[PDB]
C-alpha cells in the first residue's frame, strides 16, 4: 500500500551496506548516462517511482535498464 | 608547412549581416551592435546589397570580403555525391515507366534542343507510387 515500506526499506538496506542510493524517480533535470555513474560508484542501487494514485510511466526505463542490466560493473541492483 | 610569413596579412574577419544602403550601410554581427560602415578599397558598390553577409574586421570594423549564404543543417543532404552503382540496366521489370521517368529527369542533356525547338517546357515534378 502507499506508505508502510517504500523509499525507506530500500534506503535503509542501501546504507547499512554503504552501497549508494541513486534515485531516477522523475526526469526533471539531467536514460543511459546514469549507468556510467553507477559503474563508477561500484556498488550501486537504483530506485524507482510508484504513481498510480496516492500509461507507460517508468516501466519503460525499468526494462530499459534491465536490458542493459541482464547482460552486464556487476553489483548494481535496481 | 611554412605559412608563418603570411598569417599576419590574413586579417581574421567577422561575418555580419548587411542591410540598407543610404555611401554607408548597416551591418549586424548578431552579437554586436549592428552598426554603420562603408566598403574598403576594391569591392564594387553593386557587389554588396541587402540581405547578404559580408566579413568585417575587428580592428577598425570594416568590410573586405563578401561571403556566401549559410546552410547549416542541410549541408549533408545536398546532392549526395558519387552515387550508387545500380543503373537502368539493373532495375528491370517495367521497361516503359522508366521511359516516362527518364524523359523528365534527363532534360539538361541532349533534350533542351528539342524543347526550345518545338516550344515545350518540360514537366518539373515526377511522382512515384508503388507498393
Amino acid at each position: 500500500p502507499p506508505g508502510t515500506g517504500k523509499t525507506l526499506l530500500a534506503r535503509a538496506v542501501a546504507h547499512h551496506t554503504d552501497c549508494t542510493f541513486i534515485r531516477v524517480s522523475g526526469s526533471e533535470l539531467v536514460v543511459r548516462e546514469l549507468f556510467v555513474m553507477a559503474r563508477e560508484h561500484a556498488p550501486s542501487i537504483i530506485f524507482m517511482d510508484e504513481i498510480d494514485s496516492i500509461s507507460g510511466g517508468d516501466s519503460e526505463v525499468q526494462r530499459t535498464m534491465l536490458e542493459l542490466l541482464n547482460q552486464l560493473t556487476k553489483n548494481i541492483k535496481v | 608547412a611554412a605559412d608563418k610569413q603570411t598569417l599576419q596579412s590574413e586579417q581574421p574577419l567577422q561575418v555580419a549581416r548587411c542591410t540598407k544602403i543610404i555611401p554607408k550601410y548597416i551591418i549586424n554581427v548578431k552579437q554586436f551592435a549592428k552598426f554603420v560602415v562603408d566598403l574598403s578599397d576594391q569591392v564594387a558598390p553593386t557587389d554588396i546589397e541587402e540581405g547578404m553577409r559580408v566579413g568585417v574586421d575587428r580592428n577598425k570594423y570594416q568590410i573586405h570580403i563578401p561571403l556566401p549564404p549559410k546552410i547549416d543543417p542541410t549541408v549533408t543532404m545536398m546532392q549526395v555525391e558519387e552515387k550508387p552503382d545500380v543503373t537502368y540496366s539493373d532495375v528491370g521489370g517495367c521497361k516503359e515507366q522508366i521511359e516516362k521517368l527518364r524523359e523528365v529527369v534527363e532534360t539538361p542533356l541532349l533534350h533542351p534542343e528539342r524543347f526550345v525547338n518545338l516550344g515545350i517546357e518540360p514537366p518539373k515534378g515526377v511522382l512515384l507510387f508503388g507498393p
Binding site: 522523475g26 526533471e28 533535470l29 539531467v30 | -
Partner: protein, 308 residues
Amino acid sequence: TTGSNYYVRILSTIDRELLKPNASVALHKHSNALVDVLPPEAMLTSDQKPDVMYADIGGMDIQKQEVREAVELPLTHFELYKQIGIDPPRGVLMYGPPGCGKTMLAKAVAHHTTAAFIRVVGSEFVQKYLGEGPRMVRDVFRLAKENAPAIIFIDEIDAIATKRFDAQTGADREVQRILLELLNQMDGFDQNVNVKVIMATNRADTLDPALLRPGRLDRKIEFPLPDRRQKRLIFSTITSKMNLSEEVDLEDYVARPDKISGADINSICQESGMLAVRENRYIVLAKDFEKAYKTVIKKDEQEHEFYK
C-alpha cells in the same frame, strides 16, 4: 557579478570572519583581488504597507490556525518546539483553486509579524542578463537571513518551477538553476535560526515533485472553495462591512450552494452595492442583492437532465 566565478587572492587586513559562503564581497577593478566584505545589499522589507485585517478574512478558520500555527507562532514561540520535540515545518505550500484564501491570509499575516515579511513575486527571478537570477534569489534569502525573524513569500512558483524543462535552447537553461540552487539554498538552513518560506500558487498539479520532500516545504495547505458552514461566515463579514436595510436575507443565498469563491462573493456583494448606485441609494434593499447575484450569481453552468 560579471558572469563567472574565478580565483582570487584576498588581502591580509580583512579578517577571515565574515566570509560566509554567500557573503557579498568586493573585488578590485582590472585586478579582481578581494578587498572587503559588505552589508547585505540586495527586495523590500514591506514596512506596514499591506492592510487587510485577520478579522475580516471571513470564514477561513482551520487554514488560519494552521498558518498561524506553522509560521508566526514558531517565530515567536521558537523554543516550545524545542521543549516538545516536533520541529517547526520549514516551508508552507499553499495550493488554492481557483483562489479564495491566498492573498488576504498572506496579507493579514503581514500585520502582526514583528518580522521582516519580505515579498517577492516569483517572476523577476528571470532577467534579461544571463546568469543573473540565482544570485538574485540568494540575495533574497540572505536578505531574509540577516533580518530574522523573516517570512519569505514567493508567489505563483509554477512560473519558476515546473516539471518539464528543455535541455536545448536556453530559455529555461537558467530557470533550471533558478530552482536548482534555491532548492540547494533552502537545504542550507536546517540550523534553524529564523527564516520561513511560505509560498502560494493557483495550481499545484504541475508544481514539481522535488519541491517538497520534507525539508523544502514539509507542509501543504488546501484552500477549500468554501461551503455551507463557511459561506455563511463570508456573507456575514462582507455584508457586515456594508449598508443594509434588512429586507435582505442571509441564508436564502447561502442556500443554492453552487461553486463560489470568496472573490465572487465580493463580486456579487460589491456588485449589489454598485447596482444600488443606480438610484443614488446609500443602502441596498431587495433586487440589487438578488439582482446582482442572479446576473453574475454564477452566470450559470450547463446542468445535464436525464442523468440526475
